[PDB]
Design a protein around this ligand. Structure first.
Ligand SMILES: Cc1cc2nc3c(=O)[nH]c(=O)nc-3n(C[C@H](O)[C@H](O)[C@H](O)COP(=O)(O)OP(=O)(O)OC[C@H]3O[C@@H](n4cnc5c(N)ncnc54)[C@H](O)[C@@H]3O)c2cc1C
Ligand SMILES: Cc1cc2nc3c(=O)[nH]c(=O)nc-3n(C[C@H](O)[C@H](O)[C@H](O)COP(=O)(O)OP(=O)(O)OC[C@H]3O[C@@H](n4cnc5c(N)ncnc54)[C@H](O)[C@@H]3O)c2cc1C
Ligand SMILES: COc1ccc2c(c1)c(=O)c1c(NCCN(C)C)ccc3ncn2c31
Ligand SMILES: COc1ccc2c(c1)c(=O)c1c(NCCN(C)C)ccc3ncn2c31
Ligand SMILES: [Zn+2]
Ligand SMILES: [Zn+2]
Lengths: 228, 228
C-alpha cells in the first residue's frame, strides 16, 4: 500500500506537463496507490522565505535569520500552516514525484519556494543528519522534467552540456541532502517541437514506466554519476 | 561613466549579505559609478510566473503558454510594470551583480522568480541571439554568493562537490545564455562559522576586488571551466 505525492508546477491544465501529471495520477490510482497532488500555481503557493513563515515570538527579533527562526519554529510547532500542510504530505509519502518544465536549468520559482520553505532544518535534515543521514531517509524522489532544448543540445558536446549537469543541485544538493534515494529522472525533451505522435509516445513512455516504478532501484547520486 | 545594477536577495539589512551589498554600493558610488539596487524582499517582488504578468489581451486565451505570452507581451509593450521596471534597469546597466545566500545549491526563490520573469524572450534572448550572441551581449554579470558550507566541503571530492558544479545553471544556463560575459564569481564561504577577523577579511576582499572590477576579463564560461 504505497503513498505518492506529486508536486506539480505548471500554470495550464492542458499543457504537456498537465498531461504527464494526469497520467501519473491515473496510473498510480489504477494500481491502488494513495495519491496526493500539490498543484502549486492553483494553490497560489507562497515562494518567498520571509518572517511571515513564523507565527509566534522570534528568537532574535532584532536580526532576522530565516534558517535559525524556521528551525526553532518547526520544533515549537509555530511554522505557518501552508508549510506544515506540505510537510504532512511529504512525511506520509513513500515516493515524491516533481513534475515541472525546466526554467533556467532549474525548477520554476514557485517550486524553488516549496523546496526553500518546506524542507526546513529539523524536518528534512539536521546538522548532523544529512545526505545518507538525512531525515527523509527511506523515501524515494523522482524528477519528471520537460524542456525546450532537444536531447542532442543536452549532450556533453552540445551547447547546453549534458542533462545530468543541471540535475546536480536538485538531485544531490536538495533531495539526496535530505536523505531521499533518487530514482532515475524522467526527461521529456522538447515537446513543443516534437510531432503529435512523438508527444503521444513520450506520455505513453511515462505511463508505462510507472507500471513498474516500484521495482526500480535508485541511482548512485554521486559526482561521478552526474559528471563522469 | 559605468552603470551597475545590484539585484539583492536577503531579508535582513544587518546580514553578511546586507553588508556585502552596502560595501558594493559604497565603493562603486565612491568611484563615481551610477548605482541602482533591486532589494527584492523589500519590494515584495513577485516570484511566480503567471498570467498576471501580461496586461493586454492574451494571444491565446484558451490555453496559457507563459513563454509565448510573455514574448508577445514584450514586443507589444504589455508586460506588467514590475517586470518592465526591472528590464529598464538591466537595459541601462553595464554590470549586474547578484548578491544572495545560497539556497539549495541555487538562488533563493524570490531571485529565481526575478530570473524567470525578467529575462523573457525578446529581451534577454531570441532565435538566434543566445550564449555568445545573447541579447544582453556587451554586459557583465557577477554572482556574489555566501554559503553555509565550508570551502573544504565544496571540493571536487568533498561532500558537496566543487562550488563550480552548482554555478553551472546560473552562470552558463542563465547568464551566458542571455549574452552576459561572466566575471569570476565572488564566493564568501561560511560566514556564520568564520571568525570575526575572517569575516572582515572576506568583506575586505570584496571591497578591494570592486576597486579594480573594470579591469577584469570574463571567465571562459564553458563546460570545461565548470567540470574540468
Ligand atoms: C522562464 C522560462 C525558462 C525556461 N528555461 C529553460 C531552460 O533553461 N532550458 C530549456 O531546455 N527550456 C527552458 N524553457 C522552456 C520550457 O522548459 C518548455 O517550454 C517546457 O518544458 C514545455 O513544456 P510545456 O508543458 O509547457 O509544453 P506545452 O506547450 O504545454 O506542450 C507542447 C504541446 O504538447 C501538447 N500536448 C499536451 N498534452 C498532450 C498529450 N497528452 N499528447 C499530445 N500532445 C500533448 C500541447 O497541446 C502542446 O501543443 C523555459 C521556459 C520558460 C518560460
Ligand atoms: C532555505 C535555505 C537553503 C540553504 N541552502 C544551502 C545550500 O544548498 N548550501 C549551502 O552551503 N548553504 C545553504 N544555506 C545556508 C545559507 O547559504 C547561509 O546561511 C547564508 O549564506 C549565510 O549568509 P547570511 O548573510 O545570511 O549570514 P549571516 O548569518 O547574516 O551573517 C553571518 C555573520 O556575519 C556577521 N556579519 C554581518 N556583516 C558583517 C560585517 N560587515 N563584518 C563582519 N561580520 C559581519 C553577521 O552579524 C553574522 O553574525 C541555506 C539556507 C537556507 C535558509
Ligand atoms: C538554457 O536554454 C534555455 C534557456 C532559457 C530558455 C530556453 C532555453 C527556452 O528554450 C525557452 C523557451 N523555449 C520554447 C520556445 N518556443 C518553442 C516556444 C521558451 C521560453 C523561454 N524562456 C526562457 N527560455 C525559454
Ligand atoms: C547543500 O548543503 C546544504 C543544503 C541545505 C542547507 C545547508 C546546506 C545549510 O548549511 C543550511 C543552513 N546552514 C546554517 C545552519 N547552521 C549553520 C546554523 C541553515 C538552513 C538551511 N536550510 C537548508 N540548508 C541550510
Ligand atoms: Zn547525491
Ligand atoms: Zn557558459
Amino acid at each position: 500500500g504505497k503513498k505518492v505525492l506529486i508536486v506539480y508546477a505548471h500554470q495550464e491544465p492542458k499543457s504537456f506537463n498537465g498531461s504527464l501529471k494526469n497520467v501519473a495520477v491515473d496510473e498510480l490510482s489504477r494500481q491502488g496507490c494513495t495519491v496526493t497532488v500539490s498543484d502549486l500555481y492553483a494553490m497560489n503557493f507562497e515562494p518567498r522565505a520571509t518572517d511571515k513563515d513564523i507565527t509566534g515570538t522570534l528568537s532574535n527579533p532584532e536580526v532576522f535569520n530565516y534558517g535559525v527562526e524556521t528551525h526553532e519554529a518547526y520544533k515549537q510547532r509555530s511554522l505557518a500552516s501552508d508549510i506544515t500542510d506540505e510537510q504532512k504530505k511529504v512525511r506520509e509519502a513513500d515516493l515524491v514525484i516533481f513534475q515541472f518544465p525546466l526554467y533556467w536549468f532549474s525548477v520554476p520559482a514557485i517550486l524553488k519556494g516549496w523546496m526553500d520553505r518546506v524542507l526546513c532544518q529539523g524536518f528534512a535534515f539536521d546538522i548532523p543528519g544529512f545526505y545518507d543521514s538525512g531525515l527523509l531517509q527511506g523515501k524515494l524522489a523522482l524528477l519528471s522534467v520537460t524542456t525546450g532544448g532537444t536531447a542532442e543540445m543536452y549532450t556533453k558536446t552540445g551547447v547546453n552540456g549534458d542533462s545530468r549537469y543541471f540535475l546536480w543541485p536538485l538531485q544531490h544538493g536538495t533531495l539526496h541532502f535530505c536523505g531521499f534515494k533518487v530514482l532515475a529522472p524522467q526527461i521529456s525533451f522538447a515537446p513543443e517541437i516534437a510531432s503529435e505522435e512523438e508527444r503521444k509516445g513520450m506520455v505513453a513512455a511515462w505511463s508505462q514506466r510507472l507500471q513498474t516504478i516500484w521495482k526500480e532501484e535508485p541511482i548512485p547520486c554521486t559526482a561521478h554519476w552526474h559528471f563522469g
